[PDB]
C-alpha cells in the first residue's frame, strides 16, 4: 500500500495527474484546439493568486456558495479570435511566460456556441513553487 | 347546434382526427400501445385520447358549455410496431391550454394518470413527449445547468469525478466525512450521499453535514481544486428537505441533492428554485426510475422522465453507463444525453427519439454514469459521454486495495489519460486498453486498480431494447 | 489473524443470503417477484436485490470493517418458487428498522425500490408487499382523520358516501364548475370533486374555481339539510402553491381537500397531509399515475403497497378499484388491500395477495372510493364488495343523465339507499341486486332513466394483474 | 473572422432583407425618420443594433459568444404612401433576449435608447408581435371579461362607471355620499378619478371606508353587485 | 399633471417644459439615497470625474463572460462599469450567477488596483419583488452599487428601491431608458429636465445627463441648463438654458450626471470642460474597441481623464486646446496613443431635434 | 498589443496614471488651490494604512456596503484655514514629509460651501514601497 501525501502536493485542474506535457504534448493539444476551431487564449496569475480562497467572503451575509476568489486570472492580451495557426499559440505561450516568467500561466479555449471554455491547462508554473509533488512522489 | 344525448358511444366518434394537423403548441405523446383482442386500435387510441384529456365512459351534457373542438386531446396518427402483432404507437396531441404552467406534475397527471390502469388495454407505455417551447417557457428549469456550473466549479476540459459514500447505509457522521476527506484528496472533483441516506438512528443529516463541510474544505485547501459532496434534502416533508437545503447554504457548500421520483416533482421543483435563489447545484437521483421504465411494453421510458427533470429542475441527472452493473443500451443512452444536454435535438427513431425536441435554451443538464463502474470502463465513459459528464466511481474508489485517495488518484489518472489520448487523436474503442496500460507505468495507484477489476464485466440480455 | 479487508469482486450471497435468519419484529420486510437472468441462481438475485437495497455495492469496500456489516444489512432470508413459473422466485427481504428515515415514506422507497429494479443481472422484479412493523408506522402521523373521524364530522352514517367527478375533465370555466356542482350535491350526492388534471389553467384558475365552488358547497347545504363538500384539488407544480390552495380551502371554511400524491410525490403529500391535521381538512388522495406501476404481474410494484405506503404518508380517502368498471381491479385483490387500507390488523393470506400479516397499530384507516364507468346497476355489486365505510363515485354515472346532475345524483343516491335497505333487510345483493333496483325503479322516475340508459352497460375484459 | 476595432456600417451585422423570421421572434414595426445623409437600410440597422447587442464601434466580447444567434435584425424596409422621409422598418428580436413575465425589460430593450439617436429625426412604435412563447411567460391579467362577468353575476349588456368629480378637493365623507347616489341610481361602478390618491383634503382609507359603506348600501338598496 | 391632457381632441400638441417645485413639497420626500457628496465620500474619490463602462455586447454574455469583462475593464483604470439597461435575468445569463461573479471581478480589481471599485448591478424586474430580490443579493455581497432604469420599471418602483438603498447604504444608478419616447420632440411630450427633476425627488444617485458631442441627442447650453438642476441647491430662471422658473431644492442632495454613449478619448477634453468634475464619464464600446482590449482600455480613458483634468488645473484651456493635451499624453501613453488612432475620424454632428 | 500588468502596479487615485509631478507641477496645483479659495490639509499614512481593506467587517452582520478601513488617513496638524499663500502649503509639505519620511502623504484640499474634499494626490510615498511601476513599466 502507497499513502497519497497531503504535503505539497497542490494540482491545477485538468492534466495536472499526468506527468508534466512535453512540448510535443503541449503541441498536439494546441492543434486540438485549431482542429475544433476553439478560440485560444492565455491567462497568467502571481503565486499569491494562483489558488481558489475565501478572503472576499468577510464582507458577505450567508451567500457565499460558490463563491471563490482566485478563478479569474489575468487575461495575456485578448483571446485569439480566427486563429487557424498553432505555431501562433505556441508563439505566444513564449511571449506571455517571457513577460511574467514567475507567474502561473494556463493555456485555456474558448467554444462561442456553447459560450463556455472548452479545455484548458497549466503551462507555467513560477521555479520558486515547493507546493507539488513529482508524479512518482505523489504517494510514500 | 345538436342536442345532448345521454348514453355511451365510442370514443373514436370524438377522439380520432387522423386528419388533424398539429399544432406547434401542442404537446405531444407517443403511446406504446397494446389493445385488449376485440378492440380496434383506433378505439384503443381515442379511449386513451379521451381519458387523458376531456372524455369519459358515457356523454355528458356539460360538453355543450364549452367547445370540445378546442380542449379535446386527439389521437391523430396510428403506427404499427414491426415485429408485433398486437403492439401500436399511437400519437396523441393535447393542446397547451390543457396544462398548468410550470407543472411538471399536472403534465404527468393528465398523460399518464389514469390510461395505464384501462381494462380496454393490456399494457401501455409512454415513449416519447414533444414539449413545444411555448410549454417549456413556462418552467424555470435547472437551477444552474452545464455552462453555470463549469464556470462555478472553475472545471474545464474533461467530464467530472464523483464517488458514492459505502456502505450504503450503517457509517457514522463522522466516518461519513473521513471518507469523504479521504476520496476528494485523492482526484475525485465531488462524493456523494448515496440516495437512501437522508436522516437515520446510525447518522443524523445535520451531524453529516457540518462533518463533510470540514472534509470538502479540508481536501480544497489539501489539493487548490474546488471540491464538493451532492448533501442529501430528500426528506419526508417538504419541511425537512428545505431545512436541510438551509444548512447547506448555511454552510458555504457548493451542491445539494434530491431523489425526484421518491420525492416527487413538487418537491423538486421547489427545491430548484430554492437552488435558483440560493446559488445551490442541485444533483438529481433517479431512485425507482426502472419501476417504471425498466419494461419495453408497459410503463414510461426513461428518455420521457429525463425531460421531465429537465423541466422540473436539476444540474445532474444519472443517465446509465452502457458497460455497468444497471442496465441501459449505449444508443438509448446516447439518445436521452441529447435531450438532456442540447437546446434542439431531431427526430431519431434509432435512438428511440419519437419528436424533434426544441428546448428553447433552457439550460442543458449534466448526465452522470454511475453503478457498477471501474478504470478500464474509462476509455468508453469518455468515449460515450464526452466531457460534459460526471462519472461516478464509488465501490470503483472505496474498493480501492489501498483505500480511498489511492482509489480517486487511480479513477482521476485514468480519467485524464482518456482525455489525453482523445485530444491526441486516438481512438478510445480500439485503443482504450493500451491508454490504460501505458498510465499504468507511471501510476502505481492505477496499476493496483487495474489489477483489481481486470476481469470483472456486466454483459446480460437487455430488456429495454428500441 | 480475523478477518480483514480483501479488495474485489464475490458473489452477494457470502453476506447477503441468510436462510437460516430469524426476522425481528421490528424489521420491515419485502416480498419481491423476482425473475433472474439466465445463469444467475436464485440465491445469487435475491442476495444482490438485499445488498442493493441496503448497504453493499458490486464490489467489497474496507468501510465496512468501521461499521457492523451484521447490524445493518439487508437479509435475503427465504426464496419460495412461484407455481406456473420456470424462472419466477418471491425473495423475502428482512430491513432493520435502523436503515429508515422515521415518518419518511420517500426514504423507505429509496432503499427498497431505489436502484434494483434496473439491474442487469434480472429481467423483472416486482414488489407485491412490505410487512411495516408497529414500531416504524408508530413514527408517521399517518392520515389526517381516518374512517371515524370522517363520519363524525360528516355526520354520516349507515351507508356508502357518494362522490362524483365533473366532466369534461378539462375545459369548463369556474363558474359553470361550480354551477355543475351545485347541481350535483342537490340531488343527493354527499360529495363532488375536481378531475385529478383540474389544477390551474387557462380557462380556469383554480381561485377562482375554489369560490365559485363555495358558492355551491353552502348552497346545496342549506338546501338539502345534509353536508356537503367537493374535494379542492391542491395538487400542484410546487409546494408552495400546494399549500396556498389548501390555506384558501381553509380560509372559505369547506371541509375538503385532494391531492394526487403519486403525481406530486410522497414529499408534498406527507407536508399537505399535516397540514390538513392542523388545520381539520379533509385529504380526498387521488391515485394517478399508479397503473403505469402497479399493473403488469411481472414488473412494478402491486397497488397494495403503494396503498400502505399511501396510509403512513397520509390521506382520508384513497381510491381502490370498483371491480366492475371501466378500469382494471379483480374483488379478491381489492377485498385484500381495502382490509390493509381500512382495517386495525390484517392476517397473513395469500388467495388475496396479503404475504405478511400487517398490525397498523391504531393507525387511522383510509376510506376507499371506488371510482371509474361506474353506474346505478353496479351499485348492489359495490355495495356487497365494499359494505358502508367507502366513497362511491359517479361521474359520467351523473353528469350522463339524461335530465341532468340534480336527477342524475338522485338516482344515484335512491340506488345506493335501496341497496342499503335490502342489505339490512337480510337480503342477498348478488343474486336479488336486479330485483332491488328495478323495485326502487317503480317510484323513482330519476332512477328507472338512468337504468335504461345504462342497462347494456357492462366492462368485461381478460385481468392483467393476477395474483 | 478575428477582432478588428473600430467603426463599422451597423448594416453589416444589423440589416438582414433575407431573414425568415422564428416563431418564437418579437416582432417591431418602427415607423422610422432618418436625417438627411443616412440610408433607411442604415438606420434601421442602428435601430436593430442599438436595442439588441450593439453599440457604435467594434467589440472584441462579440467573439466570445454567437451573435447570428442574438442579435436584433432589420429584415423589411417598407416606404410609408405619402410621405417622402418615412419607412417602416421591421425588427426580429430572438426571444433569449428577453426577460420572463417582464413588461419592463422588453420596453427596455425595444425603446430604451433608439429615440435619441442623433442620426434619426423621429421614430414611433407602431406595433408589436407577441409571440405565443413570450405571452405564456406572463400571469397576465387577474380575471379577465369572462371572469369578471361571472364573479359581478352581470351579463347582456355594457357595464356603466362614473368618476367622482370634482376631480381632487372632495372629503372622503362626501366622496362615499357621491359613490352611494351615484351606485343606487343604477350605475354598476364608481371610481376615483386617477389622481386621487392620498391627499390632505381626503386621506385614502378615510376614503375606502366610506365607499365601502356607500357600495354596500346600494348594493342592498338595488339588488344588484356594486364596486367602486 | 400630465395625466390626460396631452390626449384632448381641443389641442393639437402639448409638451410640460418645466415645473416649479416648492421647498414645502420638496420637503415632503426621502429623495437620493445619498447624493454627491456622500457618495464621493463612501468611494473615497476626490478631484476628477468618475470613469465608467457598460459592457457589451449588450445582451449575449455569459455570467462568467460578464465577470472577465468587469475584471479586465476595472483593473484598467476605470471606477465602474455597468450592466446594459435591458440586461437584467435572461436565458444565456440569469442575474444571480452575474451578481456573483461580477463581485468576483469587483473584488480582484480593487485588490489589484488598490482603489475602491464597484459595478452598477442591475435590479430592474418584471415585479417589485423580483427588483428587491436583486437588491438584497446585492446587499449581502457587500458590493458598492445598484442600477434602476427609473422609466421603464416606473416611479412607484423607483422610490422603493431608492427608500432601500437610503436604508442599507447602497449607491443607487439611474439608466434613464425610454427617456426619449417622451423627450426627444419640440412640439409634445416632457422635456428631460422635467423628468431629471422627478428623478432627483423620487431617488437618484446617479442620473443619466447627455453628452453633447456622442451618439445620442442633447445640446450643450440645454444639457448645462438641467445639469445645474440636478446638482445645485438653488438654481435660477433662466430661459436661455430653457430654465422656466427658479427652483429651489432646499438642500435635497444633488445627482450625479452621467455621461454616457459613443463617446471616447478624444472627447474627453469637451466632456471635462462641460461637466466638471461632478460627472460620470462612460465609455463603453469607448473601452471594450480598443485594440488591445479591456485593461489597455481602461487606462487609455483613465489616462485621458486625469490628463486633461490636470491640464484644467494648470489653468489650460480646454475647449481650446484639449487635442494638444490628448496628444502630449500619447507620447508617455501607449494605451491611450492606440486608442486615439483607431478613433481619430470618429464624430456625432446631426440638425438637432430638442431645440429650445 | 501591450499587456496592463496585474503585479506589483497599486494606483493612488487623481493623478496616478500620469507621470510622477514634478515639483513645478505640484506647485502649480497647489497655485490651482489657492485660486479657488479652497482650504488646503495634508494626510498621512503608515505603508500598513494606505490601501483600503476589510478587516472591520468581521465585526458586521451584513452591513459591509460602502464600508472600508483606510479610506481615513491621519491629519497633519488642522486644516489651513485662510490660507492664500501657496509657499506656506509648500512648506508644510516640507515638514509633513520630515516629520514622516517613511508615510504616504497626500495633499488635499476642502471646498466648505460643498463640504467635500475637492482635490486630492499623492506627495510622497515611502522609498520601500514595491508595489507600484514606473510609467514604462505598467505595460509590457
Ligand atoms: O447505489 C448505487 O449503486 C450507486 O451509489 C452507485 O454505487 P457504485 O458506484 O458503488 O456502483 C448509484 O446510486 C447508482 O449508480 C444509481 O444507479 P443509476 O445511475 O443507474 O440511477
Ligand atoms: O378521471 C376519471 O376517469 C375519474 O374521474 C372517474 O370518472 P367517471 O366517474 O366519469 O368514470 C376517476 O379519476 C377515475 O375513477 C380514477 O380511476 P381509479 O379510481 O381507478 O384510480
Ligand atoms: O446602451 C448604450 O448605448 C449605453 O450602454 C452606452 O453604450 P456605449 O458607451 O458603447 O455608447 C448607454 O445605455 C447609453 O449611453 C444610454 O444613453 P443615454 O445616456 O443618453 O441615456
Ligand atoms: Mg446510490
Ligand atoms: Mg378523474
Ligand atoms: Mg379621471
Ligand atoms: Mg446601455
Given at each position: 500500500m502507497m499513502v497519497w501525501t497531503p504535503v505539497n502536493n497542490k494540482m491545477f485542474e485538468t492534466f495536472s495527474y499526468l506527468p508534466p506535457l512535453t512540448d510535443e504534448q503541449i503541441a498536439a493539444q494546441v492543434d486540438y484546439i485549431v482542429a475544433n476551431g476553439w478560440i485560444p487564449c492565455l491567462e497568467f496569475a502571481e503565486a499569491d493568486k494562483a489558488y481558489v480562497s475565501n478572503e472576499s467572503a468577510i464582507r458577505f451575509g450567508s451567500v457565499s456558495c460558490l463563491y471563490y476568489d482566485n478563478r479569474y486570472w489575468t487575461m495575456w492580451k485578448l483571446p485569439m479570435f480566427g486563429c487557424r495557426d498553432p505555431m501562433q499559440v505556441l508563439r505566444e505561450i513564449v511571449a506571455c511566460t517571457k513577460a511574467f516568467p514567475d507567474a502561473y500561466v494556463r493555456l485555456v479555449a474558448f467554444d462561442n456556441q456553447k459560450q463556455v471554455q472548452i479545455m484548458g491547462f497549466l503551462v507555467q508554473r513560477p521555479?520558486?513553487?515547493?507546493?507539488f509533488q513529482p508524479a512518482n512522489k505523489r504517494s510514500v | 347546434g345538436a342536442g345532448f344525448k345521454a348514453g355511451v358511444k365510442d370514443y373514436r366518434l370524438t377522439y380520432?382526427?387522423?386528419d388533424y394537423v398539429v399544432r406547434d403548441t401542442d404537446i405531444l405523446a407517443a403511446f406504446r400501445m397494446t389493445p385488449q383482442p376485440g378492440v380496434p386500435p383506433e378505439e384503443c387510441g381515442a379511449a386513451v385520447a379521451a381519458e387523458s384529456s376531456t372524455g369519459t365512459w358515457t356523454t355528458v351534457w356539460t360538453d355543450g358549455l364549452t367547445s370540445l373542438d378546442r380542449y379535446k386531446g386527439r389521437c391523430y396518427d396510428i403506427e404499427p410496431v414491426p415485429?408485433?402483432?398486437?403492439?401500436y404507437i399511437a400519437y396523441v396531441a393535447y393542446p397547451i391550454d390543457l396544462f398548468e404552467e410550470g407543472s411538471v406534475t399536472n403534465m404527468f397527471t393528465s398523460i399518464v394518470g389514469n390510461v395505464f390502469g384501462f381494462k380496454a388495454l393490456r399494457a401501455l407505455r409512454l415513449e416519447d413527449l414533444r414539449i413545444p417551447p411555448a410549454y417549456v417557457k413556462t418552467f424555470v428549469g435547472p437551477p444552474h445547468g452545464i455552462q453555470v456550473e463549469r464556470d462555478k466549479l472553475n472545471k474545464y476540459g474533461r467530464g467530472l469525478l464523483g464517488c458514492t459514500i459505502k456502505?450504503?447505509?450503517?457509517?457514522?457522521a463522522k466516518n461519513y466525512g473521513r471518507a469523504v476527506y479521504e476520496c476528494l484528496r485523492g482526484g475525485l472533483d465531488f462524493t456523494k450521499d448515496d440516495?437512501?441516506?437522508?436522516?437515520?438512528?446510525?447518522?443524523?443529516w445535520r451531524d453529516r453535514f457540518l462533518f463533510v463541510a470540514e472534509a470538502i474544505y479540508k481536501a480544497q485547501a489539501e489539493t487548490g481544486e474546488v471540491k464538493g459532496h451532492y448533501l442529501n434534502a430528500t426528506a419526508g416533508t417538504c419541511e425537512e428537505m428545505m431545512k436541510r437545503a438551509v444548512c447547506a447554504k448555511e454552510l458555504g457548500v457548493p451542491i445539494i441533492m434530491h431523489d425526484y421520483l421518491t420525492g416527487g416533482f413538487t418537491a423538486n421543483t421547489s427545491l430548484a428554485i430554492y437552488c435558483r435563489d440560493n446559488g445551490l447545484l442541485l444533483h438529481i437521483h433517479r431512485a425507482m426510475h426502472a419501476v417504471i421504465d425498466r419494461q419495453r411494453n408497459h410503463g414510461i421510458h426513461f428518455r420521457v422522465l429525463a425531460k421531465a427533470l429537465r423541466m422540473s429542475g436539476g444540474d445532474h441527472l444519472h443517465s446509465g453507463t452502457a458497460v455497468g452493473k444497471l442496465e441501459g443500451e449505449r444508443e438509448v443512452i446516447l439518445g436521452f444525453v441529447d435531450l438532456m444536454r442540447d437546446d434542439y435535438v431531431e427526430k431519431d427513431r434509432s435512438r428511440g427519439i419519437y419528436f424533434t425536441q426544441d428546448w428553447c435554451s433552457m439550460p442543458g443538464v449534466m448526465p452522470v454514469a454511475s453503478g457498477?463502474?471501474?478504470?478500464?470502463?474509462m476509455p468508453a465513459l469518455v468515449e460515450i459521454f464526452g466531457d460534459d459528464a460526471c462519472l461516478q466511481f464509488g465501490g470503483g474508489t472505496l474498493g480501492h486495495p489501498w483505500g480511498n485517495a489511492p482509489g480517486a488518484a487511480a479513477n482521476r489518472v485514468a480519467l485524464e489519460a482518456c482525455t489525453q489520448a482523445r485530444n491526441e487523436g486516438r481512438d478510445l474503442a480500439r485503443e482504450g486498453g493500451d491508454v490504460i496500460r501505458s498510465a499504468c507505468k507511471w501510476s502505481p495507484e492505477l496499476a493496483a486498480a487495474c489489477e483489481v477489476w481486470k476481469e470483472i464485466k456486466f454483459e446480460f440480455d437487455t430488456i429495454d431494447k428500441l
Open positions: 521555479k520558486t513553487a515547493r507546493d | 380520432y382526427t387522423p415485429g408485433e402483432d398486437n403492439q456502505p450504503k447505509l450503517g457509517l457514522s440516495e437512501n441516506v437522508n436522516s437515520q438512528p446510525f447518522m443524523r457498477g463502474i471501474h478504470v478500464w470502463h
